[PDB]
């Protein structure tokens, strides 16, 4: 065992294509690994006072009005999550819900997001199972109900165990008030019921022009 | 594209000799503006003869 100063010549050069072959795959994998690591472990290791307006907010929150009521976006691929959070304009807030089927504390959250989506069309409420993301065993077993919030490509919401501060009977009013306490929900805008639609496309206007 | 310089610089060749030929095509484009394919073909043929 001598001549340790090899100064290898072309072996790594001659296998550069095969080396990049799995280096790019590893980079792609650790992309989502680092995106998820920002959530795992760190938080897994651990009579106006009576809301007079809560009831009335509940009744006029039942203002679906338009076509149907839609549903939260369901993500079935981790790469789908990564290339939807990476894309899309960063001006508006992205909220993500983590869940596992059967566990209590999920249907109420989904209903709250469904009701809130109508209130704030700007927000991008979506849900995804913890299984597809690649969550850790502890996070899957006892940290599933969490409201992941992203804005500007970086985390803005640091919420896990939402049932701890919301219970299991929380309504959309409760979630809206709780989020507005931390100033994360975009402010509401005045809206009116269009007939159905007006615009078709935007291009060269070629408007009216009276000429001699 | 059909331009030799554009074809050569549009693909990562990953081999040092190929990279120097790409630089050759760029230089020929700078001085002349065409013949970028011809100069690379000539260099390749010259080195092929150098083999024997």
């Amino acid at each position: 065992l001598a001549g340790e100063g090899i100064s290898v010549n072309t072996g790594p050069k001659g296998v550069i294509n095969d080396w990049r072959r799995f280096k790019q795959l590893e980079t792609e994998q650790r992309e989502e690994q680092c995106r998820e690591m920002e959530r795992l472990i760190k938080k897994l290791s651990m009579f106006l006072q009576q809301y007079r307006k809560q009831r009335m907010e509940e009744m006029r929150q039942q203002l679906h009005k338009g076509p149907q009521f839609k549903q939260v976006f369901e993500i079935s691929s981790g790469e789908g999550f990564l290339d939807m959070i990476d894309k899309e304009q960063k001006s508006i807030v992205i909220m993500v819900h983590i869940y596992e089927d059967g566990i209590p504390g999920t249907e109420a959250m989904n209903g709250c997001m469904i009701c809130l989506a109508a209130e704030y069309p700007a927000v991008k409420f979506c849900k995804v199972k913890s299984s597809v993301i690649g969550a850790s065993s502890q996070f899957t077993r006892n940290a599933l109900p969490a409201l992941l919030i992203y804005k500007g490509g970086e985390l803005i919401g640091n919420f896990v165990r939402v049932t701890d501060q919301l219970g299991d009977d929380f309504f959309a009013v409760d979630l809206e008030a709780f989020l507005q306490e931390f100033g994360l929900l975009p402010e509401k805008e005045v809206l009116v019921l269009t007939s159905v639609r007006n615009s078709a496309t935007c291009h060269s206007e070629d408007s009216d022009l009276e000429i001699d | 594209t059909n331009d030799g310089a554009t074809i050569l610089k549009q693909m990562q060749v990953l081999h040092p000799a190929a990279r120097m030929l790409v630089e050759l095509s760029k230089a020929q484009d700078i001085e002349a503006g065409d013949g970028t394919t011809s100069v690379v073909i000539i260099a390749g043929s010259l080195l092929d003869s150098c083999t024997k």
């Binding site: 149907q68 009521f69 549903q71 209903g111 469904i114 309504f171 959309a172 | -």
Partner: protein, 48 residues
């Protein structure tokens, strides 16, 4: 059974069809038909 937790008891066609979530887009077209009939005249949803 409203997905938000409420209960809607009715025999009005428009409410029943509105509370149903469907995947086949022809069903979506039919539901939109129900909504249009309800908004235009306010009756005849089940009939249409």
């Amino acid at each position: 059974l409203d997905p938000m937790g409420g209960i809607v008891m009715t025999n009005d066609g428009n409410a029943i069809l509105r509370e149903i979530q469907v995947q086949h887009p022809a069903a979506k077209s039919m539901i939109e038909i129900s909504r249009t009939q309800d908004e235009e005249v306010g009756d005849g949803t089940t009939s249409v």
